[PDB]
Amino acid sequence: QSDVRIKFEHNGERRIIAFSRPVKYEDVEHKVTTVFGQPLDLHYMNNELSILLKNQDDLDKAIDILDRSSSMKSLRILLLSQDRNLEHHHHHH
Secondary structure: OOOEEEEEEEOOEEEEEEEOOOOOHHHHHHHHHHHHOOOEEEEEEOOOOEEEOOOHHHHHHHHHHHHHOOOEOEEEEEEEEOOOOOOOOOOOO
């Protein structure tokens, strides 16, 4: 069992990206964040419950559930923009 296939969804668009284990949440975020840009939020949905990936702990929790399932092949991770960016320049007082 090598190469982790992760399916990312953004505004309906789908993308297939493979990862070589061991895979670190920090490393994945750095790569994904650059692909779609920043700042962005990582939303993970299993089926009935949804958990926001904040730390590596949440990352391993997702895999554990997937391993138990017979459909352990791809991952359903949806990322969405937080709407409105913070980058002011200048203004009158």
